[PDB]
Design a protein around this ligand. Structure first.
Ligand SMILES: CC(C)CCC[C@@H](C)[C@H]1CC[C@H]2[C@@H]3CC=C4C[C@@H](O)CC[C@]4(C)[C@H]3CC[C@]12C
Ligand SMILES: CC(C)CCC[C@@H](C)[C@H]1CC[C@H]2[C@@H]3CC=C4C[C@@H](O)CC[C@]4(C)[C@H]3CC[C@]12C
Ligand SMILES: CC(C)CCC[C@@H](C)[C@H]1CC[C@H]2[C@@H]3CC=C4C[C@@H](O)CC[C@]4(C)[C@H]3CC[C@]12C
Ligand SMILES: CC(C)CCC[C@@H](C)[C@H]1CC[C@H]2[C@@H]3CC=C4C[C@@H](O)CC[C@]4(C)[C@H]3CC[C@]12C
Ligand SMILES: CC(C)CCC[C@@H](C)[C@H]1CC[C@H]2[C@@H]3CC=C4C[C@@H](O)CC[C@]4(C)[C@H]3CC[C@]12C
Ligand SMILES: CC(C)CCC[C@@H](C)[C@H]1CC[C@H]2[C@@H]3CC=C4C[C@@H](O)CC[C@]4(C)[C@H]3CC[C@]12C
Lengths: 102, 102, 102, 102, 102, 102
């Protein structure tokens, strides 16, 4: 099998617990109606939270592939590691606001 | 037999367990009627979910053939491996939205 | 899992208990109405308090990465260390004003 | 005079002709009232064009100071030069949308 | 001036007459109402028409910068030129349908 | 300019008159209703004609780029030229067939 090997890697670098938790939260607020409180802020907070997770997932794929294969450049890795670390940090910050406003 | 030899390879690089579930779920949503909730979003989510699997399957066929037969080209494998791994990632992401909205 | 590793670092350098407390305080005054006493000063004090934590978190990310990898430069580290310590100092002052005015 | 020397350089890397036009455009839409058509989209489009203009100006300050002063590093300049050009590109793109929706 | 040097270069890789035209058509159909004939297909055709040009513009910035500065890497340029030339081709095809459906 | 050169190159290798005529014929047939005689055959014929035209354009872009840049390979060029010629043969036959049923 070859697809199963890819699925494990692609599922290794994504928080399925947090990603799936936000999935129903977007659904629950959507069925609650635009007139409901914090509808406008919760939609954008969740949307960019999931959006940041996708970009995080893509970045983690690049770093993992580039780590062992490439050994010459290290300055590119340092920038990518910082961007991956910082982007994860903003997901932690957003999740608190979702929890606080939820 | 020579066809069974090809059929094993053509089945090894496909998640037939996952592909069949999306196939049956697509059947259910169509028979539930357009008036059913999330009809417009579920069809496109499943459609490109199935589409991404076929594209991944085609990519896996090329990578497997090019692995052992050719060794000089190395960036082409790295681009294809990164494209295959990332394409698998969005199937994982889309599957999450399928379960959440289903 | 790699996102767990990134979540470990991104959460170690954040005052989660205080960040959550300020976020909930901000929601309470917001629902309390602009006519509430000390509305204007409470919002700006909390707002820049949360802003300071985000800036501190990013600075702590840079310092944590640059410590072990970089050894040629130390004057840059000294400036970055002082900015983080002083920025943390102004945070402590704010919650004193927040607690006093709340 | 020294503030004259700084003032000229500060204006050498800013398009005051374009900057001032948006400022009056933001004033016009702000006084026109939220009830005006395309109020929400105009405010965000104009504001982030102004914000992008400031960020470009700060980037140009760094490049000018670093260009003649520094000769060893070259990768940093190319990354800064590119981000300067692409950031200008979005201002051109955004300005077209303000003109179209004006 | 230094902003004009970037702005003139960033404008040399855009067809502003072509970009501005599509922006007006998008405004025209939008004010015309969702009930209008071919409202749905016109919105999505124009939306990806504009979106494609931004992607080409970003690629054109990279291509121009990389051409003179770097000379060792050659296969990267051919992929970038192929992506730019093909993406321009799809813009021509899309513009045909918008004219046809308008 | 740079987008102008790309648009000229991409427009050289597309028969815009035939594409535009096919698009108008498809639009007219679609407006004429499903009850129209030869509806489904006309729809599928025009759709596959447009698809063949797009594929021909992509192949021509690839051949035009690969001609001067690469000289070591000739058999691939011969295969691509044969495929392009055969595809234009089929699309010409298709337009003849639509003209017959028009
Ligand atoms: C609104 C936000 C969430 C979206 C856009 C923010 C992103 C693109 C920006 C905001 C702050 C930025 C970081 C700020 C500081 C550093 C440290 C430096 O040594 C390398 C670049 C790096 C790592 C930047 C990478 C890009 C970054 C993460
Ligand atoms: C909406 C989506 C599913 C359609 C478009 C997806 C495809 C065409 C795009 C989206 C993101 C892209 C990837 C983004 C980043 C990289 C890393 C780079 O080193 C090689 C190319 C590679 C691997 C790209 C390959 C093509 C890619 C997978
Ligand atoms: C009023 C506050 C909240 C906003 C501005 C704060 C920041 C930008 C300023 C205010 C005081 C400043 C510090 C004042 C004194 C020192 C010691 C000196 O040897 C190095 C710079 C350093 C470490 C400064 C760093 C930047 C600093 C922290
Ligand atoms: C929505 C917009 C306005 C905000 C985000 C834009 C910024 C943060 C991003 C988006 C596209 C990015 C650029 C995309 C491509 C390149 C070329 C590469 O060789 C160096 C990085 C560079 C130059 C990136 C710099 C940062 C960049 C400009
Ligand atoms: C529906 C469309 C607009 C979205 C996806 C289109 C883009 C991402 C895809 C579709 C066809 C692709 C091209 C197909 C063939 C080639 C030739 C090869 O030697 C290099 C890659 C290149 C140049 C591909 C680049 C990416 C490409 C242009
Ligand atoms: C429904 C139809 C139009 C789609 C299938 C057509 C394509 C995929 C097929 C049909 C006929 C085929 C061609 C038939 C004969 C030749 C000559 C041979 O020396 C090289 C391959 C080449 C050039 C084939 C290329 C692919 C081809 C053009």
């Amino acid at each position: 099998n070859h697809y199963a090997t890819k699925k494990s890697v692609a599922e290794s670098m994504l928080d399925v617990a947090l990603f799936m938790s936000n999935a129903m939260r977007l659904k629950a607020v959507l069925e609650q109606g635009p007139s409901s409180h914090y509808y406008t802020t919760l939609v954008t907070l969740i949307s960019l939270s999931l959006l940041l997770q996708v970009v995080i997932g893509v970045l983690l794929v690049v770093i993992a592939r580039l780590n062992l294969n490439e050994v010459e450049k290290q300055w590119r890795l340092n920038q990518l590691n910082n961007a991956a670390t910082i982007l994860v940090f903003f997901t932690v910050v957003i999740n608190v606001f979702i929890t606080a406003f939820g």
